[PDB]
């Protein structure tokens, strides 16, 4: 029921936390609603959309193939790696690694992909190349999820993330084929049930990527719209709250529900 900013103020009061939100028109890039949109928040696994964007840029340039098989080792395995652990004995293709990173938040898959783009510094260089001067990746999985207060490492702002997602998915910077693939991986997200998907009305499109961190950090980046077409980008980040995972999820879903209820108001 409440208006989006009313809901966010309720959520911050209830969580004793800080929310960052932007809603951006996909076609025009206009900011429709914003809250703390210039403050830094830990990206957590939401960075993996940018990561696979960088991978696809290399594919477009003929420097990478989605079919290329990467053989990795026990040393590469980290916490939260369901797919990459399963495939340790036989390896995974670059495309399979992106699918695992995005759809299942597989952490080792993300580290393997990070190596291919020059590590966190290489990914940050890619961001600068596409005109994002704010977002930064500094660490690998799993330390990037620490969410220490006041730590600028591995952070974005809601405004910069929305603009960057728009650039990756709709500008000339990736090929049409690559844009369709990146969006498809997001459509196929398997771990985002409790968030915007839980309040998404019948007949709407959604493509998303979530993140979770320490110290209450939680987030989602999404493209969604009525009539089964993407219309807007929504970014919602939460930081600095002692609340349980259930509560964090419920609050993000509530902010999403307010954005949807007030879609044309």
């Amino acid at each position: 029921s409440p208006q989006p900013l009313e809901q966010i103020k309720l959520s911050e009061s209830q969580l004793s936390g800080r929310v960052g939100m932007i809603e951006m028109d996909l076609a025009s890039g206009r900011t429709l609603t914003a809250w703390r949109a210039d403050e830094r928040f830990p990206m957590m696994s939401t960075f993996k959309v940018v990561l696979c964007g960088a991978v696809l840029a290399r594919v477009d340039a003929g420097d990478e193939q989605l079919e290329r098989k990467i053989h990795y080792r026990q040393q590469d395995l980290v916490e939260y790696s369901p797919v990459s652990e399963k495939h340790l004995a036989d390896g995974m293709t670059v495309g399979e690694l992106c699918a695992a990173a995005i759809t299942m938040s597989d952490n080792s898959a993300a580290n393997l992909l990070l190596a291919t783009v020059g590590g966190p510094a290489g990914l940050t260089a890619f961001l600068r190349q596409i005109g994002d001067n704010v977002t930064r990746l500094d660490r690998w999985e799993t330390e990037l999820n620490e969410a220490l207060p006041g730590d600028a490492r591995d952070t974005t702002t809601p405004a910069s993330m929305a603009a960057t997602l728009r650039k990756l998915l709709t500008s000339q910077r990736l090929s049409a084929r690559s844009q369709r693939q990146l969006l498809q991986w997001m459509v196929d997200d398997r771990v985002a049930g409790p968030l915007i998907r839980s309040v998404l009305p019948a007949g709407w499109f959604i493509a998303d990527k979530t993140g979770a961190g320490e110290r209450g950090a939680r987030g989602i980046v999404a493209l969604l719209g009525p009539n089964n077409k993407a219309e807007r980008i929504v970014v919602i980040y939460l930081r600095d709250t002692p609340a349980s995972m259930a509560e964090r999820n419920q609050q993000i879903a509530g902010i999403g529900a307010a954005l949807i209820e007030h879609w044309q108001r």
């Binding site: 916490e79 652990e85 399963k86 495939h87």
Partner: protein, 165 residues
């Protein structure tokens, strides 16, 4: 019934058929194909940006294939975690499993993965342990001080740690 649990993980055994695994885990918790090939992957409660889970691998894609690998995250808690950076630094490649446990603490570790590539032979058995400092284990969030120790034929091949001491 419930979701996948540590108890179910312990009840599932090497040498079981796919149907035996499904009957214990609860088929509604499990999947195969896609990302998981001919393995059976079973979810527990939500944790971090995924779930606690188990994955069971089989000798082949055949219906009578037997479990030759067991892996899990966040289904099993260490019994008495005492790992430290100093202890981790004392661990050396070439140590036996018994030597490693004497170094890191007998109750510091859980079994992340165990695979018998020559099943029913033990030749080439691979074992991955997750080991934890006193407050390092988390079943629902992110570890706060852990190590990955891996073995082939019971001999340590490598080690890696995060955030110890």
């Amino acid at each position: 019934a419930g979701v996948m649990t540590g108890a179910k993980f312990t009840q599932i055994q090497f040498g079981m058929t796919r149907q035996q695994v499904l009957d214990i885990a609860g088929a509604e918790n499990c999947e195969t194909g896609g990302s998981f090939g001919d393995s059976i992957h079973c979810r527990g409660h939500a944790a971090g940006d995924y779930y606690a889970y188990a994955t069971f691998g089989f000798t082949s894609a055949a219906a009578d294939a037997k479990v030759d690998s067991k892996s899990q995250e966040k289904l099993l808690a260490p019994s008495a975690p005492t790992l430290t950076l100093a202890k981790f630094n004392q661990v050396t490649v070439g140590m036996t499993r018994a030597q490693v446990l004497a170094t890191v603490g007998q109750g510091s570790c859980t079994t992340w993965s165990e695979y018998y590539p020559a099943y029913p032979s033990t030749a080439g058995v691979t074992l991955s342990l997750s080991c934890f400092d006193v407050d390092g284990y988390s079943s629902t969030g992110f570890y706060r001080g852990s190590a990955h120790l891996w073995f082939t034929d019971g001999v340590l091949q490598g080690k890696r740690q995060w955030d110890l001491v």
